[PDB]
Each structure stands twice: as structure tokens, then as C-alpha cells.
Amino acid sequence: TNPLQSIFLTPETAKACIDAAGGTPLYAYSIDKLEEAADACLAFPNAYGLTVRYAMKACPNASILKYFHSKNIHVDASSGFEVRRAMDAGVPAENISLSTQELPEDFAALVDMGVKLNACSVSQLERFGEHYAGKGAKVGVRVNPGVGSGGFSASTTGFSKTNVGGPSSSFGIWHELVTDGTVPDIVERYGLEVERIHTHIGSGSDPEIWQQVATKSLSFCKVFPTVKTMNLGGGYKVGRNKGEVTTDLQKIGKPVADAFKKFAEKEGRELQMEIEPGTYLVAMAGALVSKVQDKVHTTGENSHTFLKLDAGMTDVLRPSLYGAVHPITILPGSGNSADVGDETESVVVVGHCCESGDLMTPAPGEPEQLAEQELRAAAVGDILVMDGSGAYCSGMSTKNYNSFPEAPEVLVDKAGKAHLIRKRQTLSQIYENEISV
Amino acid sequence: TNPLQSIFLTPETAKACIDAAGGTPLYAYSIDKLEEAADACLAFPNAYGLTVRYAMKACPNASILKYFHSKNIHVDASSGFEVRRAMDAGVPAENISLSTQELPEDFAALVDMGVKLNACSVSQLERFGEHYAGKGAKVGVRVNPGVGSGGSKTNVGGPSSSFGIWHELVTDGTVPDIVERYGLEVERIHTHIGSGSDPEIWQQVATKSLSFCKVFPTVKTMNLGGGYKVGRNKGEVTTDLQKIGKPVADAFKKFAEKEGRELQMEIEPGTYLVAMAGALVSKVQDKVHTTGENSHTFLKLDAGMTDVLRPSLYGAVHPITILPGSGNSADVGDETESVVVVGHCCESGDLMTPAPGEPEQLAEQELRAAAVGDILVMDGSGAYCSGMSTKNYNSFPEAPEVLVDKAGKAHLIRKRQTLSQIYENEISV
Ligand SMILES: NCCCC[C@@H](N)C(=O)O
Numbered sequence A: 001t002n003p004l005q006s007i008f009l010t011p012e013t014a015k016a017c018i019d020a021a022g023g024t025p026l027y028a029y030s031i032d033k034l035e036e037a038a039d040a041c042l043a044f045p046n047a048y049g050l051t052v053r054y055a056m057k058a059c060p061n062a063s064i065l066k067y068f069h070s071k072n073i074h075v076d077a078s079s080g081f082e083v084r085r086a087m088d089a090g091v092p093a094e095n096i097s098l099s100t101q102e103l104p105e106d107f108a109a110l111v112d113m114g115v116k117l118n119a120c121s122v123s124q125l126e127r128f129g130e131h132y133a134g135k136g137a138k139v140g141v142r143v144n145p146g147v148g149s150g151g152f153s154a155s156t157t158g159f160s161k162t163n164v165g166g167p168s169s170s171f172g173i174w175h176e177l178v179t180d181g182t183v184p185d186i187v188e189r190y191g192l193e194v195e196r197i198h199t200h201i202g203s204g205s206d207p208e209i210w211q212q213v214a215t216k217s218l219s220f221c222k223v224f225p226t227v228k229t230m231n232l233g234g235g236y237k238v239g240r241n242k243g244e245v246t247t248d249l250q251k252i253g254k255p256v257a258d259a260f261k262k263f264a265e266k267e268g269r270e271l272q273m274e275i276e277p278g279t280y281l282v283a284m285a286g287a288l289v290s291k292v293q294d295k296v297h298t299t300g301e302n303s304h305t306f307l308k309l310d311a312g313m314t315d316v317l318r319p320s321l322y323g324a325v326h327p328i329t330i331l332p333g334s335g336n337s338a339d340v341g342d343e344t345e346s347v348v349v350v351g352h353c354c355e356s357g358d359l360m361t362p363a364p365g366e367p368e369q370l371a372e373q374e375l376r377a378a379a380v381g382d383i384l385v386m387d388g389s390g391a392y393c394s395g396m397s398t399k400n401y402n403s404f405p406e407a408p409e410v411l412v413d414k415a416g417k418a419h420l421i422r423k424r425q426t427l428s429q430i431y432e433n434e435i436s437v
Numbered sequence B: 001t002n003p004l005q006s007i008f009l010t011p012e013t014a015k016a017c018i019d020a021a022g023g024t025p026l027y028a029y030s031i032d033k034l035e036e037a038a039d040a041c042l043a044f045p046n047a048y049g050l051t052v053r054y055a056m057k058a059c060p061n062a063s064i065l066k067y068f069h070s071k072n073i074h075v076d077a078s079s080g081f082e083v084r085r086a087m088d089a090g091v092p093a094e095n096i097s098l099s100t101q102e103l104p105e106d107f108a109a110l111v112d113m114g115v116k117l118n119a120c121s122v123s124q125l126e127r128f129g130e131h132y133a134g135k136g137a138k139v140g141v142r143v144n145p146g147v148g149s150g151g152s153k154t155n156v157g158g159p160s161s162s163f164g165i166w167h168e169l170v171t172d173g174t175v176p177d178i179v180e181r182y183g184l185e186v187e188r189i190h191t192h193i194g195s196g197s198d199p200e201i202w203q204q205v206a207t208k209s210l211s212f213c214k215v216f217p218t219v220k221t222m223n224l225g226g227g228y229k230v231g232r233n234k235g236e237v238t239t240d241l242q243k244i245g246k247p248v249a250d251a252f253k254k255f256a257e258k259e260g261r262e263l264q265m266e267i268e269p270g271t272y273l274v275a276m277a278g279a280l281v282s283k284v285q286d287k288v289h290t291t292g293e294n295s296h297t298f299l300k301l302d303a304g305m306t307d308v309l310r311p312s313l314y315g316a317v318h319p320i321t322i323l324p325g326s327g328n329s330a331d332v333g334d335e336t337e338s339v340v341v342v343g344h345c346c347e348s349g350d351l352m353t354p355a356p357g358e359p360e361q362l363a364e365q366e367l368r369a370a371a372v373g374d375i376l377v378m379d380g381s382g383a384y385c386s387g388m389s390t391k392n393y394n395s396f397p398e399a400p401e402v403l404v405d406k407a408g409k410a411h412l413i414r415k416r417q418t419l420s421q422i423y424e425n426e427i428s429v
Helices: A011-021 A031-042 A062-070 A080-088 A107-113 A122-131 A175-179 A182-189 A207-222 A249-267 A318-322 B011-021 B031-042 B062-070 B080-088 B107-113 B122-131 B167-171 B174-181 B199-213 B241-259 B310-314
Strands: A026-030 A050-055 A074-077 A096-098 A116-119 A138-144 A193-198 A229-231 A272-275 A286-297 A305-309 A328-331 A344-350 A366-370 A373-376 A383-387 A409-412 A418-422 B026-030 B050-055 B074-077 B096-098 B116-119 B138-144 B185-190 B221-223 B264-267 B278-289 B297-301 B320-323 B336-342 B358-362 B365-368 B375-378 B401-404 B410-414
Touching (some): A011 A026, A011 A286, A011 A383, A026 A031, A026 A418, A031 A050, A031 A062, A031 A409, A050 A062, A062 A074, A080 A096, A080 A107, A107 A116, A107 A122, A116 A122, A116 A193, A122 A138, A122 A182, A122 B278, A138 A175, A175 A182, A193 A207, A207 A229, A207 A249, A286 B122, A318 A366, A318 B310, B011 B375, B011 B401, B011 B410, B026 B031, B031 B050, B031 B062, B074 B080, B080 B096, B107 B116, B107 B122, B116 B122, B122 B138, B122 B174, B138 B199, B167 B174, B185 B199, B199 B221, B241 B264, B310 B358, B320 B365
Parallel strands (some): A026 A409, A050 A074, A074 A096, A096 A116, A116 A138, A193 A229, A229 A272, A305 A344, B026 B401, B050 B074, B050 B264, B074 B096, B096 B116, B116 B138, B185 B221, B297 B336
Antiparallel strands (some): A026 A286, A286 A305, A286 A383, A328 A383, A344 A373, B026 B278, B278 B297, B278 B375, B320 B375, B336 B365, B401 B410
């Protein structure tokens, strides 16, 4: 019952990556897994047109940007730095939209090159309008619809928890500022033209929740008759572990596309749709590849067997940050599929950082508790593969903690060959900006 | 009224760091606060000697290292990379202790230079013994005493921890026979299970840790590790080094009387040395509102989890103060406002004012009324912030670090990273 491969790495393909990266740890990305997600998103049900934007904050490697560009997938940038980064990878400016918490001081330069801006607060709209007064520049507007992920918590707001929308969220402009005239007054003051509305409150895999997401956001498109595009954001869930449900884009897409048809039947306007998936595009396409460098034991009550890797929260932080479980497969350090065998052992996986919280197998949703996974019996030198690590891992980790170098990145082509796309960082590069004093 | 200053920055001094750094965000370190912490640690009560090691994993800046080195403070490194990094800052090899989860493949090269190694596993002790078999080597042993912080959760000791060698492998001959099979000389013992502020607990920590130096008569040093608690927020208790050290020093006296050996003591403060000595200096670049049930006023900083992760990672509260953006203390005023503070990352969890221990729940702080452009200073951020953050998330460059001397002058110790450097190691095709 031992897995003969991981989500996309056989024992032969894993050693091929390690050789290309000069050792462990490393990030492995599979072109095959990127093509499945790209095609699945480009097949999203739409009524009058679809645009897929990659939320590059999930994984900003230029090869990933170049690949999604070749598939006619656009880019959703989270800051002026991501805008300038995507343009370095060859993405044209017009294919980038900027939705940020911090409007960069050089936003006007980006807008001039063709970058579409989604104003995310009153302050950003006014700064945009001050610079392009009476012209009247087109701009996007992100709205906080007044509700977030969960509805009204099946009762009243309840506890004020973090959310992508609602009264406990700082994202977007509060919906009451749209309906009380505050935002339309700013638009008229600077002669702006609102061409696009942006929302981001979708979650789960319920088609009837996504239809309500669309209906509510579309109601803001009738406030500004010049709007021609509706950006519904991301949030499509990916089930990394067995039993968890991945969102079916065809099942939730058709009620969304019908909500677009109902708008065109009640308003007479056929709107372009946009989606901003981050996790759904790159999550299962990436995997952390590390080696078991040590194996220790405790005895007595609450004792465990610990597998210590040469990686950790420096490379995958989601276990420590959320208590997220990742699929884990242990392959023979020989690289031969004949040495997989059929021996299992329940273990706890820990990271190489000298920190108690550097745990790789936590209890679901509780990063302070231990949990054991039944894996292949591992000797020192065997490869551990953490799958589903292509989103918010390389692009969001505590790199250089304990002064560990930033892990390299490898691309595995459709033929099973490994290509290095980011060389390992050197030690001196970690403190190359320090100044003597 | 409102605070006319932060823990160590006035509006004028804060503007000085911003000038020296080119803008916000930035880390600021106080030479004064480092000096105050260095003296308290160097005054730890001891019976027969004390060595203070800075756990550089909390802030590895070379100026911080050079400073502690000038104060006779040694280094506790947690990886082969930190050992070399500390050596690049001018720290001798002999002033470095290596206690790491991951033994580097070039560890023999570090040991020959003078670096002292504490084996944290049977595997490590065996790899050390195989390379130095019968050559008169000396080594330390890090022992899991069998109890963590309780004198199933993640702990620094006990059956739940992977640090380090399980005590039952020492008391059943296994570790003794490894040392004897390779001709090793166990030089010191290493534990790290102390916590809190109770001197009775610290005395139980020292006694149980000293019971393992009985197994190896060659032991001359006893490293009790770190974990000295720092209360960043007003009302929280900071460990009194003087009152917990008197019962610990008595344990060394009781060991010398009954066992006949006067052991040297070592401590590894990390948080205690640098936490209060550093602050995150940022700018309020936006301010938004909501209405209705559980509505809030939000301050959007130009920093976030990319710079200070402890709020999101632990739900840890940090002391916060707001200064006028003009930099003139005459502009502090008397106006206040309860606000939620959020970072600049497009992330629902980039909260900077969470509930204590619940990083997903919002909890407002009463601060000075903030206009866009004002300065927010987050104190208690010199430990596990610049040395432990999600930098380059949303491609934000690594923030600069500034040192503030005794005369109030700001000195740049790390320039702001450029966008190009964030992906200077990427290869095409
Ligand atoms: N804010 C991040 C939340 C991650 C949720 C996780 N279950 C996923 O599917 O990606």
C-alpha cells in the first residue's frame, strides 16, 4: 500500500530533480500539472466572455509567468513590485491588473504603460482622479459588498474574524460608500470612467453560494453604467489531502454564467467576466523535495518517532501558520522504484529550524499540536515529498531563518526531464546588503 | 494624554531613521537597549563562572554580533550557515557553539577551526565519533531531560520534542558506550527546558540538568540554554535574572559539594537580549472604515507580515505607538481612536492587532488618532522579526535596518533590498 510515486514524482524523477538542483531541499514544478489547471480555468463557464488572471502572489517565478502567458492567461498583481516583476518576465502591461493594499508612489508610470488599476479605497481613487482629472481615465473599483466568506455566520456577525469581505475586512471600498453617493461623487469630480468592478468574497465548492456571490457583485455594476467587466476574484478551493473536495469549476460556473445572463436580461448589458485564481492554478503543480537527514525516538507516554528533514518553515510555512496538512510521500533515496517496498511506520515530521513550532505534520487546523501520518518506513537518506506546495510556499515562507539559503526551483517538462529555474542562494547573498558600522 | 514617544524613539528620532533608511518601512535598533540587556545577562548570578551566548537566530545582523562581541558575549549558532555568518562578522571560531537540528556535511571543517559542537542526536554523536575516532576529540551532548515546560503540544523537551537526545539513552548506557567506542571526551552538557519567571522552576531545571553531568565525570561546563521571558506589553512580567539565578547558582554549589566538581555555567539568551532593543518603523498609508455590527476603523501600514510575523504566527501582541508624521513632538496632541491595524499584504491574515493567542480574531488598540502619513512604531520587534519573516511576499523588498547610537544618531546597517535582487537567482528556460 506504499505509494509508488507522489502526485507527480516517481523515485527516478525525484533523483533527477535533486541532481539538477545540486541537492536537497528544492521546489519541483510540473508542466503537466500546470497545463491541467490552466485548461480547467480557461474552460470556466461564461456568458459573454472570460478572462483568467493568475494571482502571481502564490508563486512569482518567471517561468510560471512565461508559461501562463503562453496560455493567454493574464496576471493579477498585488503590488507595484509584482507589476514591475511580471513585466520583466515578458508579460505586457495591458495583461496586468493591480489590486493592492498599498498604492505605489509610481502608480501613474504603471498606468501610462497600460496597467489597469482597480481602486481599492477612497484614498486610491482620489489619488488616481487627482492625477487624471477630467480626461477621463478608465479605472477599476473593488467593492466590499458588505459580506464575506460564510454569509452572516449563519446568524449575526458573531466574533469579528479575519475575512476577505464584510465589516471585519479592510479589502475594497465599503458598499455603503457606493450607494450613498460618496464614490460616484469622486468619479464625477475628476471626470473618471468606471469600466470594471472587482469583488473577492467567493469560497467553498457550493454552486448556489457562487451564484449569490455573482448576483450581489453584479448589482454594483448597475450603479456605474460604463462598467463592461466584472472581476469575481479567486478563492476556488483545492483539496490537497484525500477526502477534501476540490471546487468543480463546471458545476459552480454555470450558475455564475446564468447570473450574467440575468443581468443582461434585466439591464441589457453583456458583461465580460474575470477570475483571479491563485491556489487553483499552482497548488498541486508544486512539491517540496527534501531528504530525511535524521531520525530520533522518544519513549513512554505520548512518545513518537520523529523524521527530521533538511527543510522546514523556511520553505513551507503553511503547516506552522494555519495547521494545514499537506500530502506526504516518502521515496527511496536510491531512486529505484524497486526499492519502494511495503514497510510502513507512523511518524512525526519536523523541520531543520531550531524552533519548537517547526512542525511539518500538525493536527488539522491546530499548528501547536502533533499528528502522525502513516508513511513508508524511512531510512536516513530517503526522500520526503510534500505535495500541494506550489502555492504560498516559495512565495510566502520564512526564508533565511536560521540563515538557511533559499531553496532552488526545478521545472519538470512533459518528458520527465528536470530544468533548473532558480539556482540555490549562497550564504553571502543572505547578508549582501548589510553595511559595516 | 498620548505618549510623546515610543519605547526609544521620539518623533524627531523616528524621522532620523526614516531619513537614514530612504523611507519606510525599516527596523530600528537602540544601542542603549542592547547595552542595558547585555549588562543584565552578564550579571547573571553564578558560582564558578558564566559564559553568555547570544542566540543569533533572533537577529543575525553583523553589527548586532560585533556589538555583543565587544561586550564579551559569545554566540550560540543553530546551523552551519550561522557559524560561518558569525565568523564573517569577526567572531572567533572558539566563541561559537553549534546546536543544530541539521548537522552540516562540512562540520569537521568547522570543528577543526575551533567551533564547539553539541551533539543533539545519536546520529550526530556517531557521525562526530566516526570522523574523530581515537583522536582525542572533545564534544558536548544536548540532552532531552524527559520533561519539557511542565516542572502533546510542541515543546522544547519531553516526549513531544525532537530536541535532543532522549534521556533514557543516556541512563541505559547507549550514549556512554558511543563515547567510549570512539574515544570521545564529553566536555559539556546542554539543556533548554527553562521558561517562565518562577525561581523554583528554574532550580528544578538546573538540578535535573546537573544530574546528567554525573554520568560523564569529564564534563566541565553546563549550558542551561535560553527561554528567558520578556514582557513586551505593559502589565506582562519579565524574568528577573537576579532572583532566578540565586537558586540556580546554589544547584551548582550543591553539585560541587557532593560530586567534587565545580562546573562552569552557560546561558543562551535570544529574546532577552534583542527583543526590546528593536522596533518596526512604518507609515500609515491608508485609513478605511466600515459600518454596522462589528464594524471597525482600519489603519493600513506600509509594512506587514513581510516584516513582523509574530502577530500572525502566534497571535502575539506587540506594544504600538503612533507619532505625528511631521516628526515634531509639538504635534503629538491629545486625540485618540480605537483602531485595527492591518499590513500591506493582500492576505486576510495580515493582522497587526490580533486577539492574544488567536491570530484570526480582531482586537482594537487605543492609540493616538492617526492621519495618513503618520508613523506607527511597533516596539518589541528586535527578536524573530527581521530574522524570521515572510519577506518578499507580494514581492516587497526586504526592509532596511538602522542603528541608533547613544547620542541619538541613526546609522544604516542594512540598505533596502532592490526589486531586482528578489529574483537575481532565477534562470530562464
Ligand atoms: N488564507 C489561506 C487559506 C487556505 C485554505 C486551504 N484549505 C486551501 O484550500 O488552500
